[PDB]
Amino acid sequence: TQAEKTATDLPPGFSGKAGSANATPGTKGLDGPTPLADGSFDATIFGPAKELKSADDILNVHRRNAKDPFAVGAVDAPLVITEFSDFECPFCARWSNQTEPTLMEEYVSKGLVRIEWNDLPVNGEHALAAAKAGRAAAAQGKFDEFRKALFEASRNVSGHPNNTLKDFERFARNAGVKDMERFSREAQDSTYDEVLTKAADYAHGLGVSGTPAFVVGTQYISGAQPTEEFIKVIESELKKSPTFS
Ligand SMILES: [Cl-]
């Protein structure tokens, strides 16, 4: 009785960060995307790592492409979150503003989670124009900063902000986009039209129809569910698969 034993294992509802605690952090690609030869980034990246043919192929949604300027976190993180999102969507804004920072702090910054953005424009012309602007920011390595500036500007909006070019230019300046002539041209011209069509067709082929939508490891989540739900799923998925080889 004059001894201390190690903590008992508890049911997961009382176990706190057990998946995290036992997972192997990634060590590669923590410093951002790999640039192209000219120091710009491949803003035409979209899609899965490999075709999905059945439910058995669910992990294929996660690209783990070191060149991807739409991704944050270790390319060898044990868990990937694949997100399908729309820049006019208030549920997408709420996830970005209220859930993502917690996931950055608890998981991404520790090498445990990589988050990959995928365009799924549902809100019409403003959403397509915003996605084109996002790809123009990503070409200059500023996707994350652009996304945060735009969604923080939507933090009090219950509907759609109806952003247009001058809004996107402000978010790009806020984000530190260095070549504003290239940004403004690519935000408007045909550069990203093909890839946005292909991204939408890819999401529709998975049956993903509503934003935001997520594949957290092997688990699909529809909508801006509570932060605690994302944490529980992350912990569960890290328990199932603690290491990426
Ligand atoms: Cl596919």
Numbering used by the authors: 38 to 282
Task: Reproduce, without paraphrasing, sentences from the article in which this PDB structure was first reported.
To reveal the structural basis for the potential thiol-disulfide oxidoreductase activity of TsdA, we determined the C. diphtheriae wild-type TsdA structure by X-ray crystallography refracted to 1.45 Å atomic resolution with R-work and R-free factors equal to 11.4 and 15.3 %, respectively. The structure is a single continuous amino acid chain covering 38 to 282 residues of the protein (full length MW of 31 kDa). Despite using a recombinant protein lacking its transmembrane domain (1–32) for crystallization, four N-terminal and seven C-terminal residues are not visible in the structure, most likely due to flexibility of these fragments. The thioredoxin-like domain (residues 54 to 160 and 230 to 282) consists of a five-strand β-sheet in an order of β1↑- β3↓- β2↓- β4↑- β5↓ and six flanking helices (one 310-helix, ƞ1, and five α-helices, α2-4 and α9-10). The thioredoxin-like domain is separated by the amino acid segment 161 to 229 of the α-helical domain. The conserved catalytic CPFC motif, residues 126 to 129, forms the active site together with a conserved cis-Pro loop (residues T248 and P249). The C126 residue is located at the N-terminal end of the kinked α-helix 126 to 136; such a location of the CXXC motif is characteristic of DsbA proteins. The cysteine sulfurs in the CXXC motif are 3.40 Å apart with clear separation of corresponding electron densities; thus, the structure represents a reduced form of the protein. In addition, the α-helical domain of TsdA is comprised of four α-helices. Of note, no additional cysteine residue is found in TsdA.
